[PDB]
Amino acid sequence: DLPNDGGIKLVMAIIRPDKLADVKTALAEVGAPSLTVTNVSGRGSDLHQKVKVECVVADTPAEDVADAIADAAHTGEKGDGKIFILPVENAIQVRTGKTGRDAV
Amino acid sequence: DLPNDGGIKLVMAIIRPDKLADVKTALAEVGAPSLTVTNVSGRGSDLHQKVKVECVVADTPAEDVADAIADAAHTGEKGDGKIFILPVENAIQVRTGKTGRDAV
Amino acid sequence: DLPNDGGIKLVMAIIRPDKLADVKTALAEVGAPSLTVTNVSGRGSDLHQKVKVECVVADTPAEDVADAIADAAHTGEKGDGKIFILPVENAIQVRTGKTGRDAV
Numbered sequence: 585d586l587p588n589d590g591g592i593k594l595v596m597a598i599i600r601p602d603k604l605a606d607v608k609t610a611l612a613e614v615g616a617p618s619l620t621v622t623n624v625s626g627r628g629s630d631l632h633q634k635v636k637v638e639c640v641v642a643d644t645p646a647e648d649v650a651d652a653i654a655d656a657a658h659t660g661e662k663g664d665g666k667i668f669i670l671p672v673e674n675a676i677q678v679r680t681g682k683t684g685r686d687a688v
Numbered sequence: 689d690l691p692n693d694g695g696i697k698l699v700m701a702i703i704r705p706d707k708l709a710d711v712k713t714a715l716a717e718v719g720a721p722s723l724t725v726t727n728v729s730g731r732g733s734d735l736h737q738k739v740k741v742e743c744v745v746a747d748t749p750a751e752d753v754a755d756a757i758a759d760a761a762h763t764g765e766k767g768d769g770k771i772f773i774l775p776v777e778n779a780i781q782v783r784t785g786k787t788g789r790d791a792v
Numbered sequence: 793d794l795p796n797d798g799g800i801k802l803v804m805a806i807i808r809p810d811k812l813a814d815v816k817t818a819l820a821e822v823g824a825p826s827l828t829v830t831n832v833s834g835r836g837s838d839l840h841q842k843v844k845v846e847c848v849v850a851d852t853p854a855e856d857v858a859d860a861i862a863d864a865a866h867t868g869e870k871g872d873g874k875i876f877i878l879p880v881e882n883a884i885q886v887r888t889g890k891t892g893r894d895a896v
């Protein structure tokens with residue numbers, strides 16, 4: 585019935601640093617603006633600089649958030665990166681102590 | 689019977705950098721001192737600097753660890769952050785090769 | 793039948809920075825070269841510098857990847873770190889939009 589089967593998901597993307605601006609805009613547009621960003625490096629297949637974007641979601645289908653990130657991060661060249669979806673079992677809002685999907 | 693249903697959990701917190709000291713103390717007090725820290729930035733709702741604290745736990749209830757972090761990280765102002773709990777299926781101690789919940 | 797029960801896994805290692813070179817080589821040798829690296833700090837049991845290595849895998853058994861990392865990261869001294877395995881529910885290749893285990 586509910587998005588994400590009434591649960592919580594972590595959308596974790598590794599993308600090109602120069603695409604972060606467009607990804608932020610895409611996340612806002614899809615209604616899930618919250619995100620955490622980490623400077624990382626990697627290789628697919630000397631490491632290349634990338635950025636990790638993490639969005640924990642509940643109200644918004646994880647697949648919709650992943651699509652929004654992927655569309656904005658895309659260039660068509662090797663090195664564009666990947667998005668992964670992981671399960672999250674609980675969430676706690678530090679300011680209030682509120683827990684569960686409504687804390688996300 | 690066992691804490692965390694006899695399994696392993698990742699407690700992942702995104703908090704204010706200035707609260708890391710108190711969070712370290714709280715983690716020690718609750719008996720789960722091990723942690724990994726990452727410099728990150730984010731927004732909720734220009735990114736703001738935050739810190740990610742990760743604690744993989746087995747012997748200590750994940751909820752107790754989350755509460756300890758949340759209490760120490762709290763200020764009452766927007767920007768205090770969030771704690772998320774994710775499942776961990778296995779753990780390996782590099783020094784010994786020991787595996788399972790006892791490796792955590 | 794398939795590796796990882798036909799699913800996807802995240803292998804997340806926290807190791808000594810000076811072992812990253814040997815870990816990269818070990819990952820290539822085991823046939824799972826892709827990785828993402830993060831500068832982190834931590835304590836087990838003043839934080840010490842460590843490196844986080846993340847490998848999302850499907851075709852290669854997660855346990856085999858963990859063993860490869862652990863062998864290369866090992867020194868025998870306290871501080872060698874840990875490897876954790878987490879479930880991943882989906883993967884998307886940004887360049888192509890391809891999804892599922894074949895996107896990993």
Ligand SMILES: Nc1ncnc2c1ncn2[C@@H]1O[C@H](COP(=O)(O)O)[C@@H](O)[C@H]1O
Pocket residue numbers: 598599625626627628629632634662663664665666826827828829846847848849887896
């Ligand atoms: N299977 C994987 N596991 C971990 N990180 C990955 C994986 N695939 C891609 N990455 C990250 O995403 C970046 C771009 O991937 P790619 O477009 O496949 O070359 C890499 O440099 C890594 O940082």
Ligand SMILES: Nc1ncnc2c1ncn2[C@@H]1O[C@H](COP(=O)(O)O)[C@@H](O)[C@H]1O
Pocket residue numbers: 618619620621638639640641679688702703729730731732733736738766767768769770
């Ligand atoms: N749903 C979320 N997903 C990812 N990161 C989040 C989320 N909510 C909060 N954060 C992180 O936590 C910080 C503080 O959150 P807040 O107190 O909600 O403004 C943000 O700047 C982000 O780094």
Ligand SMILES: Nc1ncnc2c1ncn2[C@@H]1O[C@H](COP(=O)(O)O)[C@@H](O)[C@H]1O
Pocket residue numbers: 722723724725742743744745783792806807833834835836837840842870871872873874
């Ligand atoms: N249970 C844990 N949760 C989170 N990080 C850990 C844990 N155990 C070890 N670490 C990380 O791994 C590093 C080395 O661990 P150790 O060899 O146990 O002292 C620490 O400094 C932390 O960064």
